[PDB]
Amino acid sequence: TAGGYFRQSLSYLEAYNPSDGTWLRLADLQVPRSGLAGCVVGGLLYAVGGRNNSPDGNTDSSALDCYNPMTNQWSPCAPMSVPRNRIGVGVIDGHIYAVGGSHGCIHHNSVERYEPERDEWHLVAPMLTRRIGVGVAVLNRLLYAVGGFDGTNRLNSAECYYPERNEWRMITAMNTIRSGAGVCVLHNCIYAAGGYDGQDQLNSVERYDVATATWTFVAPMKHRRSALGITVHQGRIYVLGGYDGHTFLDSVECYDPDTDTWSEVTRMTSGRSGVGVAVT
């Protein structure tokens, strides 16, 4: 996990071993950030977008930094065209897609594209919908933008991107309005975990099936959470960070796809929300 928020934006980069279970620090981020997204390309970990909500500022971030697990260094790469708080990111073929996010009162529909070989950014076609807190998942090398917030309404809609024609296509909407949900692909297709629908945080978790173009519910977690991190590696996806409306939650819940149960596995030293998570 990289970044996060508790009283202020955080520089924490700090891992967890579900095999061991203990918590230990690594190099801090260069600039504290929350509302960012994390992803891997070629083993390296890249923290993307966000903002630094601090006692002396609230600066939306257009930067992104690459970290290497071989040498514990964060190295700045080229920044985007605009800052993106509450961004969503998707990895196809080890390439970086930056989706939506906000800059001040502007809620982006713009999307950008980054190549770790070359280190650049270029604009692609805008989304149908402006989306901050948008969940982004990649499936069969298609880029999906799920839920979010357009500045007035929170969204249950989702849309798909085609890397060959620069066109966005609305698909079937989720059963639940979700902003700040945890969105990832597990096994077959797209999972949508938790989020905020404008009145409550969500523990219900939805799942999309592309062949049937159908969203179907799965067992809900024990504790609600929005602005959570999400990552896949060994199946059995965990949820880390978030917020339920009063306390910056301190639960790591684990959903098993076979028996479809949730149970709290562990906890890091402090509550936290708005993280960018990926695993190498």
Partner: peptide, 9 residues
């Protein structure tokens, strides 16, 4: 503070 992520105004 803010309902979705808990960050301050």
């Amino acid at each position: 503070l803010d309902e979705e992520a808990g960050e301050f105004l």
